[PDB]
Amino acid sequence: KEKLDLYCEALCDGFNKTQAYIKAGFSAPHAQRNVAPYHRKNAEYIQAYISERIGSDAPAARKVVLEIMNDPNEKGGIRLKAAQDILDRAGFGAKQKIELTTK
Amino acid sequence: PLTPKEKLDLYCEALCDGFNKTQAYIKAGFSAPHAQRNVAPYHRKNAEYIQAYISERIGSDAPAARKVVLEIMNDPNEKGGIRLKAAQDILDRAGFGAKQKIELTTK
Amino acid sequence: LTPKEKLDLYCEALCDGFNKTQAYIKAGFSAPHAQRNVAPYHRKNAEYIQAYISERIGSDAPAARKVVLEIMNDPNEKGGIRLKAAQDILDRAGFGAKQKIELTTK
Amino acid sequence: KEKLDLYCEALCDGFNKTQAYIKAGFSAPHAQRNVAPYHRKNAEYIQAYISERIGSDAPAARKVVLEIMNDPNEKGGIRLKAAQDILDRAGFGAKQKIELTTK
Amino acid sequence: LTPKEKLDLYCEALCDGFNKTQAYIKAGFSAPHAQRNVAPYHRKNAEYIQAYISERIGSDAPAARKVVLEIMNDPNEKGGIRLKAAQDILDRAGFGAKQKIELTTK
Amino acid sequence: LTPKEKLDLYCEALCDGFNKTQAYIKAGFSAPHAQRNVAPYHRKNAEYIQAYISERIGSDAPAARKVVLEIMNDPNEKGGIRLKAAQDILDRAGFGAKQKIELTTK
Amino acid sequence: PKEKLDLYCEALCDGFNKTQAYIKAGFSAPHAQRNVAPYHRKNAEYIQAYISERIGSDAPAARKVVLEIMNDPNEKGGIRLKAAQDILDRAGFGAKQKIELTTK
Amino acid sequence: LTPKEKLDLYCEALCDGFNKTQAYIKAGFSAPHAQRNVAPYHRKNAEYIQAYISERIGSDAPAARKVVLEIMNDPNEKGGIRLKAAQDILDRAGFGAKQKIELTTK
Amino acid sequence: TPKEKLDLYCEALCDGFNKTQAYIKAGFSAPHAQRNVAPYHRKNAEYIQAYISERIGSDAPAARKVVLEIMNDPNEKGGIRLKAAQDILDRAGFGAKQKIELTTK
């Protein structure tokens, strides 16, 4: 279970099937076949690992959007859009909508 | 120096402030050496609380941006489109929106 | 001195200086425990702080309504902005969108 | 209940709690508590009154859109957008949309 | 010659001169007492005011329809405007877009 | 000479000239008393007048189809505009959008 | 009658004139002002179906146009990107989930 | 050489040359009758025409996939283009949209 | 080999937008290369779609790196950084908010 996690991290970081698979610690001579089955047997974990890796970088972008909202030297529209986004994360959304349908 | 939940709160703050996972790990109070493993498990076992803390911090910093949008809505020397978008945003925050749209259903 | 008003001042201080510690030390407590004691007030009263910020935005809303009306009636700005302002004010008046037909299959 | 509506219009025009409060006829010293409680207890009607005040300019917006739609010296895109808006108000909408489920 | 004509004239005056007090003075009453009864009379006929505004914009819609057709057929404007006008008029004709599929979960 | 074709001419004149009084005087009746009975006449024949206006608006669709096809076939047109025209005609041809899945909570 | 209706619809689509289309419908030129309104309104559904088929028959041309604009290296990258997006949307790769949460 | 082979070749020729009479003569039929037989021939086999055009659109999908991937991997492009390419390729990759809360009123 | 060459054929169609060269290089019956391919496409359209989907999806980490780095580059236009941050937060799980509905039957 540790080799598959390391393979997922290496594939997520260096975008290569054969290079990451040979970097896992396995046989070099057959690096085109066994790798498709190994990827086919752990698709759920690969998706989960890539999703959590993408999600773990959120604080840096949150800091970036907050800083652009408070930096006076950037265009005002960008600050307005950043403030709108962060306030929308705070929890204030849109309002009423009515539907008519009886046939 | 102890109470690992306080160290976890410091870890969350360090991850929120610095653009390096290794620096955050060294700032938590753990062993710096061999920084290739033993870090993924610590990062993965408390992801839910990390997300909750990030959400609470963003919501607590939202009022500063609300003040910013209000002040830009109150700036007379700024472009009209920016003022219009700010006014739309704050009025939508007050709770007054758009109206109906009709749907017809067929067998 | 009455309670719930000090919470209103605390909410305003947090809204103004984008920092929890400065608002907490300025409200009514001591320095020795300024990282924890503030967490119970913030986590147990999140609903009231959100309500206070929303009510302040709503109380400043009439100024923005006046602003959008004046921009809609000021000819010194680009025509698109006036058109968008007129559309928004008419949508606020109570005139919405039109028909949409749906057919469902299996 | 005319005084509350007058208070709402005065607050809408002079954008200040203290100035509107003193224009109501009240005490200068109590500008942080009692006015917040009265506003919190009559927010629904205050909001309705400000909405009707903004809505009373709807004929002005109709005049603005009609006059802007008929100017030949203005850029074509705005004339098109005005025509689209007025036609959407006229009562002509979009067309059919189908739903397919394949669970 | 009835208060229905005074109400229609009042609505038209508000539409053509964007002011409540002057419109009320144009209704036929004393100008000085324009702050008290006009708000109640204005609020008691909000539905009719909205209906009149809607009917007026719908009756002036054909001029805008002619304008949008002419801009769709006017060669001196940039192509994007002609395309958007043609798309709008064709969508009005009754030829629209197609399906979107839905997946439901438990 | 019957109310159906006279009403059709009334609708066509209203569609062409953008004037209520001109259309009514073209109908064939007395010009002066055009302010009172006209509200009842419009209220009693609004549905067919609106249907006629919609039919006239929809009948110009072949012109818009020709315009969108020619703009899609002009190499001197902006690439985005040609792409949008091709998208519009293909979406009318019968190729639409795709899946949308929902996750539900009790 | 269905072929005269087809020619009438095509003439209306191409020669932008109601009088020309009606006279092309094979009828008398002089009395071309009255019968034409009933004739046009009595077959609106078939006219719409034929015109829809006419607009759809040029769809392969739009396919060729979008492919050619997507394959031109001298075009801005955004236009090629949007053309690829559109062609993929027909290819069978679409958007993803949207969740609804209710509070009641 | 089969009649379905002549018809699919006709569909491909219509897709390539964009002329009905030329496409009809390219189908394998008589040139002198290019106005009559062509309307019924196109109307009676619309389903297969739609299937053929859909297959032609689907067979070029790898080129568009390569284009979007290279645009996401092209360093000389403006930031908006790279961002849109990356977002689109991830949308196909399988990471969904945001969350939405719904409020209902009786 | 019945099925690994078929996977190679799927990849060849995904990469080089052609049919005759890929079909002759796969190892199949050349004399009937216009028909046999229609039968294989009709019998394996779902598998072809799955393979092309995997081909497009497997490059996702490169684009994720691109969007993350654009969010962290100070020399890029502000709108681009804002949109990148919006996308990364949308993946984190914070989107737009509530909508209220009123029904009249």
Numbering used by the authors:
A (entry chain H), D (entry chain B): 23 to 125
B (entry chain I): 19 to 125
C (entry chain A), E (entry chain C), F (entry chain D), H (entry chain F): 20 to 125
G (entry chain E): 22 to 125
I (entry chain G): 21 to 125
Extract from the study:
NV1 TerS crystallized in a large monoclinic unit cell with five nonamers in the AU that diffracted weakly to 3.95 Å resolution. The structure of NV1 TerS was then solved by MR using the model of PaP3 TerS and refined to an Rwork/Rfree of 25.9/29.1% at 3.95 Å resolution, enforcing 81-fold NCS torsion restraints. NV1 and PaP3 TerSs are virtually identical (RMSD ∼ 1.1), as expected for two proteins that are ∼65% identical in amino acid sequence. Peak 1 and peak 2 had a roughly equal quantity of protein for PaP3 and LUZ24, whereas most of NV1 TerS eluted in peak 2. The same intramolecular plasticity observed in PaP3 likely exists in the TerSs from NV1 and LUZ24. SEC-SAXS of PaP3 and NV1 TerS revealed a radius of gyration (Rg) of 41.44 ± 0.40 Å and 41.33 ± 0.43 Å, respectively,, which is larger than the calculated crystal structure Rg values of 33.84 Å and 33.32 Å, respectively. The distance distribution function P(r) calculated from SAXS data indicates a maximum diameter Dmax ∼131 Å for both PaP3 and NV1 TerS, also about 25% larger than the maximum width of the crystal structure (∼105 Å). In contrast, using 10- or 8-fold rotational symmetry did not significantly improve the FSC resolution, supporting the notion PaP3 and NV1 TerSs exist in solution as nonamers.
The genome packaging motor of tailed bacteriophages and herpesviruses is a powerful nanomachine built by several copies of a large (TerL) and a small (TerS) terminase subunit. TerS also stimulates the ATPase activity of TerL, while repressing the large terminase nuclease activity. Thus, three related small terminase subunits from Pseudomonas phages PaP3, NV1 and LUZ24 are polymorphic in solution but adopt a nonameric quaternary structure in the high affinity heparin-binding conformation.
